[model samples]
Structure formats: structure tokens, C-alpha cells
Target: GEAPNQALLRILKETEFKKIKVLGSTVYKGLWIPEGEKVKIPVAIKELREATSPKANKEILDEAYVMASVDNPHVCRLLGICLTSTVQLIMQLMPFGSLLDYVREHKDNIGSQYLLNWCVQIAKGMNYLEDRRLVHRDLAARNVLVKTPQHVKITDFGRAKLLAEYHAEGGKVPIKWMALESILHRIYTHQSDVWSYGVTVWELMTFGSKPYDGIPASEISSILEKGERLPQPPICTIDVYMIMVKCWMIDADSRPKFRELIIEFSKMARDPQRYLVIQGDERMHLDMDDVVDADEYLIPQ
Candidate 1:
């Protein structure tokens, strides 16, 4: 089969590019095909810096290549790429920004249904990746882009690795979101992604609070070793918090798979009123005594 470069070149020949603004690391907002053209389109362009090394270039290209193969509603679309003077990857624009930013900005007004929907969308996307044997090593709220109130798409594949090619110790890891196995032995898998997804759920419930709260990174491993997981968010319902806790099971095999999480989220979406009652009321109404202590589940290794 012809490679992605050929398609990228064809797109470059047909479209004109204009910068809009920087979105994140190497990612930018831009317009392609130019205004006034019949096929003009808005796009996000991720360009490699001029000072990038050959090894880094290959990593970028590999990421773009993997992205081009993905086609799912909850995963960001890779439109194309241009590699002439400076390598550029074209993707669909996410107008509302990351899920982390969205939750922070709209927490006061957004309902539980909307928040649950974001979790469902992420589960569905991760399920799709897992089916293809791809492990998203860095799945967090910041990597999930909000397209609209009801639409979110997972992006940023820089840390993704195929099940066959994954090596636990290759790159810089997000310490707070990493699983115990990954932290201890540099091992990663779909189960590790589930662990990260649970942290994202906590982020959503807490309105984007930092994971592990005030705990230092150096101390996280010991804390986890003692089976001390994060406490339930006051704003989150017991049912949802239980799901998050299950995801933090010390035995990685005990964590729910993405497919299992999808089923759970679907149930929540169906009867959101029942499950969301706790979230609808003021946080002060919650019974502090009802909160589960992290020490109760301590498992000695």
C-alpha cells in the first residue's frame, strides 16, 4: 500500500495553510485550503521544531502514522500530514479545548449527565484502541479534547505504544497518573491505561484538581505500596466513586477492561437521575462518615 506521505503531499498541493494560534506542545490552530475556497477547512496542525533531532523526527512520524490508521468517533481524526521543510501533522480542530479545561470552566453549571457522558466517551475510545491492541500510556483529562458539550475525542498519541512494542522505561512518564506496575517495574498495558482513566475520572469529579493532591511524587510509590488510594471526591456519587476505586485495584488483573467500563458507563447514562442525585445536591449535604477510608483496603505486597 502507498504510504501516508503520498496522501499528505496531495493534501499540501491542494490546500493553503494559515496559522491561527498555538494550542499545546507542537500543536496549533490553523486554517487549511484557505478562505473563499470551496473546500476550505479548519484544522489543527502539529509541527515539529526545526531543532528536532533525527530520532525525535522518527518518533513524530511514527505517531502520525499510527494516528492516520485510527478511525473512531471518540478518537481525534488525523486529516493528513506535510513533511517538506518542517514536518506537520494535520488534524480536526477541537473548539472547546481539553476535558480538563472544560471541567474546570463549566463545573458550576454542568450537570452530572454531561460529566458521565465524557467518561463514557473516553471508555468507548479506549475500548477501540484496546481492540486493536494499542495501549495509550498517557490517558489523562488533558489528552481528551472536548469538541462540544456532548462530544469529546481522545488525542495526543505521543505516548501510545502497540502491545507488541511497548517498553515500560522508554520516555518521561506522568507520575501521578501511572499505575503501580508501571511505577514499580516499568510495565505498561491496557490495564495501566485503565488505572490512568480512573485518575481522569477523579480529575473530572474534583473539577480538575491535581491527582494525589498534596502528596509528593517521590512519596507516591510508598503510599500506593501501602494500598492507600485517593479518597473519594465529595462531589462524586458513591456509585461512581466505587467504579474509580475498582480501577485502582492493586492487582492489575482485577481492574475493569475498557469494554467493561463502557457497559458500566452506559448504565449510568441510562439512569443518570438515580445515580446523579448525590451530585445534584450541595457537597455540604454529604455524610463525611460515609466516606470509605483508604486504609481499609490495604494489601501487603
Candidate 2:
């Protein structure tokens, strides 16, 4: 039980708490728990839905253990856990919320440089996990947190699978973001994570548009098998689109590793105009809000 800060202990002794707000789902509830006699800390508690089931309980505890073990600026920090009344894993609060929500909220105002920076930060975080041989099977904008206006941290490690244990089957994967091989053979690897990272890039370019828009889960495999892919978002530049194209290559080996992506994105971020050049009469100032129709994209999963 390692804590990120002194205010947040490894395991909170106080079972009592005052509810602050509810996180995205009901499973997590934000609470303000007492740190000292008069001090309190804002924390998000992820309650175990299947508290009675031994297997489910173990999985929840395992997730907490994995999160607690990692200490990185790009990775979310686990504060503590409470197992008295009910099992709850305490987590640090991200003020701006998930990357999905943040991008959508600030898309109109966010510059190309900032958007590229977000991708770089995400790549760096995934690179950290890659260095640890950890496969985040569920990498997506929704699983990332906007720690600040310019900083983002990767979160949601419940589906994380170690490279050594990559053969284990995952439960209910988000098909839209999965790799072709992963979809066909139920295989998960760092390469599969690379595929998801590509989809995430598309999502960011489109200002949080859902991947495989209007496509059913059952039909995605066939579509992918036929060599079809999401069209380049109007806002996406050729270099960025090429990086995404490489990521979607049928051969998993063809995809760029997180390390490679970090370098490519960092270079792009350094000189946006060098890679973000527009084509034809389409002005760069085209109103993104007007170009993107709300109904065209599905709601976030």
C-alpha cells in the first residue's frame, strides 16, 4: 500500500465519509474524507460492484495493487483503499476530467500545437507502460485524464495485461479500438495497444468523435478484413494521418512502437506547419464546430 502523498495514506482508517460528487459512473463516488482533525482530502472511491464474489473482489484488489505500484507523472496515482464497510479504491482527482471530455469541451479553442502535445503526453505515458512490459488493452481518450490544460495522464488499468501473461483473455473489449489480430485471435500485446493508440489519435483529431462511427460491432471485423478504415478527419494533416495509417496496418509488426510515436509526435509538435499543411482552397480557419455534425458521431462508450 504505497501512497503518492502524505495527505493520502496507503489505507485510510476512517470508514466514515461525506460524499462530494459522483464520478462518471455509479461504481465510483467522489468523497471528502478527513485527513486530520480539521483537514480533508478530495478523493474518488471506486466501489466494488460485486463485493460478495471472491473472484471479482480479487480482481478489484489486483487493479488497486497494480495502480499503486506504478509511480509516473503520466500515470494516475492511487491514493489508498478502504475495505471496512465496502471495498473502495481511492484515487486522485483530475480537475479537467477525462481526455475525451476535455478535448470535446475545448476542441474549438484548442490549437493544433496543443492537440499534438496531448498526443505526445499520451504516447509518453503508454511508453512508460511499454517499458514495464504492461499492455493497456483499453487505451483510449476515455481512459486518459487531463491533469492540467497541457498535461494528461493514463488511467483505467483494470484491463491491463502484462506481456508475460498476454495469453489471458480479456472481457468485453472495446472493438472499435482493438487491433485486427486481437479481434480475430483474441490476442493482446504491446502491438495491439499500438493499434488502440492510433484510434485515439483519430479521436483527438476529430475532437473526440467515436471511432467506427455508424458501424456495428459484429460488422467491424468484416469491414477491417476488407481493408477499410476510418476516413482521415478533415482537420488531420497528411503526416499525422500517415502515422495513423501505419498503426492500422494489417500486420501488427508494421505499427509504430510507442517510443517511435513519441519521437514522431514530438517533432510534429515542435513545428506544426511543417507537418500540418492544409490542401486546396480549404482554409485552416474553417470552423471545426460547423464542419462536424453532432449526429454523425456516436456518443462516447
Candidate 3:
């Protein structure tokens, strides 16, 4: 398939998307037929929730605008948008699904080095967002796409805000992955993104286990207030766990920038020796009941 010309970052014609199959609830895999061309371009189409209320669709446009402007190797490429009765954000295909599912399905079978590689890759993407003054309020393993271990890219900008600080007064909040300040004040920033990245790192280390496993959303702020964090993952080395600690610090200013995180993880990925430190395996914290909830740990108001 040929690359999109003037179609690169604009609203696409309805005829252009020769959608093949609906992959899941929100995404569809399709062939993009550029006008008058025989090229059959393969791509993914993420719907904007079957056409939400007219007012809220502004959020979808903003998300599309962000992805269209963002050009980074570590971030998912947004080809264009399709608003045919419904809204669909066209993007590059990622067949392996999300990093969360990949880690959980592979478990101990996957190489540890690749985990570090993904960590570095995500941090780079986050750093790019940071430079762009955007806050990925939903940064986590589930929002990250993985083609190969090294082919990691940030996706799902539904909760993102292109502001140094933005407040949310209602709706569901991803409590487990949120920063203390965000939970208390409902404000988001790059600092909050760092805190969520810490939780994401924990997820990768534990093979996609939910954070604050046995805890309730109502009690998360209290736990953070008490300086209690999600216990270190059993397979996690202390060195990596400490990075999570720094990210979870009570003072928002104390957390490392995504740039710092990228550098740290980048160095660790190449060295390989850094991860050889002892892994302390503790007993299962969550999923002890033998059932994993499909719903993420969110506080819906």
C-alpha cells in the first residue's frame, strides 16, 4: 500500500476506508483505498465510541489532532480520521495487541531484556508528550501497543489533555494508576503522567497484574497519604522498584521527569547486568480468589 499523500493528516473520505473486519468493541481492521488508486492499505480504525453526544465529540477531535501532530518512532502513527456517521481514528496496525495482554499471556516465557526495552520505549514516548505539554492521564500497559517487544508505541489518548494542568470534575477515574495529587485535586500534569508510568512499570514487571490489587478505590488516597505503595513485584529487582518509588513520591515535584526515566531505562536496557540483581518473590497479592475482574480499578462518580 502506498503512503497517504494529502490524506496524511486530515478527515478521510468515507469511500477511502474499505473496512474489512470489526476486531473488537472499539477497533476495526480495514483496507484503506486511496482515491483512484489500486493500493490496498492495511490500517486500524479506532472508533470514537459509536458517535458520542455532539458536544463531547470535541474531545475526539482534539485527540485526533494530537495524534496527527505527534510524529515519533515510539508513538503510534495516526494516518487520519474517518467521520462517516460515526468517528474513527485511522492508525498504523499493531497485531500483538496491548502490552498488558502480551505480558500476561507470555508470563515468564518472554525475555526480561525485552521488558526493559519496552520500558525505555514508553518513557521515550512519554518524554515526547511531556515536551509537547501533553498529559497522558491514561498511561498504562493497556494503553501501550506492542508489535514486537521492541515495537512498543503509546496509544489511547481518550484521557489525555494538552495542558500543563487540567482538572476533571466527574466521570470515572483510573484510581490505581493515578498520582496522589490527581486523586486529591483532580488535576493532571506531566508529574501525574510520571506517577502513572510508575504504575505501568509495575504492571510490566508483574505481567499485567492490577495495581492496589486487594485495595478499594476509596482507600487509594489514604494509602498514598500513608506513603504505602503497591508492594514491589516479586520478579522485580530492587533497582527498578526504586524508580517506581521515586515516581510515587508524595510531593509531585519530587518525581523524575519522563526524560530522566527514559535515560535511566535506556541505560539499564543496554547494560543488561543491572537486572541480574536478586528478585524477591512474594506470594500473590491480587487474583487470590482465582478470578480476574475485566473492569480496571476505577473510581466512578
Candidate 4:
């Protein structure tokens, strides 16, 4: 309980430091602060080193919208703490629902309506990040958190960076979820994130299935290098599949922008059945439905 409260206060204090509007609980509006004299904070290298994988959920990275907290979309702040080491901060809370939960319970009965709404929220959030020239290196269901039917937000920013800044510097790229050029050639951009977003769309369609199910991590590198995609699920919509393919294109420049993706998702959300005509094209080739079942993909308990 003490650790929980401490973390809560830390996050709260950080939020206040960044000038974000605080709601009833710890919830606050997300802010997009760029690097400069006004926003830059002293980050502790030691804390960065100590931060663990799965430090928080994916919703934090996605920057999902919160209506009650604040209204402006261009809201962002920076928080830097000096404990053992200094660290800059971004506002990202833990995700609420796990995609695996839905798949285990609703695979056969899964409706396009639900996927439409879900994917819409994701695309909208990514649009927010893209508008600010930011890229969410990790875009997946595990990172997406649902607050309600209409209140899903993206979390997790430990792996995120400015679209050009990340590639300019030799940082550790998120290989598993990264686009092909980003993985093999160290080329990252807004379009690369779109590629990852496409795979994430596939994950949502399949209810939390792995990006490259049954493929070894090493082999994923190869497949991506060779312009290959993981098996598509049996329940995906044709429009959704086509969008995913567009995102996965080897040429990052050819991928759709977050704005375009938002429009596509908005259409699906408005009329999901309109896109389900090609459902027959979705084939479930992977033996296992869930990625968590694999030892290599397991997260810490």
C-alpha cells in the first residue's frame, strides 16, 4: 500500500509539475511538451537504467484522450525527478483491460462493431502523437487501456521519442513491434510507427494475438526484412486488412498518415458492418490463439 501511494503521489506531483489539469482521481489531461529551454528537464541516467520492462501499460504511450480532465489536444508537460538519478517524466497510467481477456471469452462471437470502436480510439490517439511529431514505438493491445466504452487511452512512454530524434540518435529500437526498415536499417520515422500501428490493428482484430505468432524473434527480423507479414486472423474485416497491409509496406513513405488512419477508423466506427463484407478472407493459421501462452512472450507475473 505504501509503494502504491508513493507511486500515486509521484505521478500526481509529476502531473502538477507539468501544468496538466487534474481530475477527481489521479487522472489528468495529457500534454505534449517538446524539448527546449521551457520543457527540458534533467533526467537521471541511473533511473533510466533501473526502469524495468513492462514498467507500465501501453495506453500511457498512446496518449488517449480524457474529456473530463482537460479540453486542449496540444497539452503536454515534462517532469524530472532526482532520486538516485534524475529522470524526465511523461503522463502515462496503467491500462485497464487486457486484450487476452476478450479473446478468451469472445473470439467466435466477436463482432465488427466492437473492433471498430476499439481501433478508432487507437488511431485517434496515434493521430494526437503524430501531430506533435512524436512516435509511439510500442503500439499494442497491452499498451491500450479501456476506461469505458468510449474512454480508451494509450499509456507507456518509456520507449517513445520524437520521430526524428529517435533515429538521429543511436537508441535501442523496439524491434518486435518496429517496422522493417527501422529494425534492419535503424531507420525510424512517423511512417514506421504507422507500420507498427498496422500490426497493432491486427492484434485488436484477433483479440491480443501476438504480432508474429509462432515466428521466432530472429525470424521476424528476417520476414520483415524480406517484406513478409504474419498470418492474418480469420475474423478481420477487409478494409482493416487492406489498411494493415498499407501500414506494413516496406516503404515507410507509402504508409498512411495518422490522420488518414483516423479517418479510416472513424468510418469503421460509424458503420462497422460496411467493412465486414470480406470477413471470409480472414484465416486463422496460427495454432495458438494467444501470445501469452508462449514462454518467450510471457510478461512478468
What lDDT score belongs to each candidate, Candidate 1 first?
A: 0.78, 0.76, 0.78, 0.54
Candidate 1, residues 240-292, lDDT tens digits: the string is: 88999999998989999999899998899887666665444333210233322
lDDT of 3: 0.78
Error of 3 at 46 (Å): 2.2
Query: What is the overall TM-score of model 4 with all chains considered together?
Result: 0.61
Off by over 4 Å in 3: 1-8, 36-39, 49-52, 276-301
Each candidate's TM vs. the true structure?
A: 0.84, 0.82, 0.85, 0.61
Q: Comparing 2 and 4 by lDDT, which wins?
A: 2
State how far residue 13 of model 3 sits from its true place (Å): 1.8
What is the alpha-carbon RMSD of candidate 4 to the true structure?
A: 13.9
Residue runs of model 2 more than 4 Å from their true location after superposition: 1-9, 15-18, 27-41, 277-301
> What's the lDDT of the predicted structure labeled candidate 2?
0.76
- Tens-digit lDDT track for model 4 on 28-108? 433322333233221211123333534433333223222112211222222322222223333322223444455445566
Clashes of 1: 0
Scanning candidate 1 in windows of ten residues, the lowest lDDT window is 292-301
Q: Which residue runs of candidate 4 sit more than 4 Å off their true CA positions?
A: 1-95, 99-110, 163-165, 168-173, 277-301
Candidate 3 TM-score versus the reference? 0.85
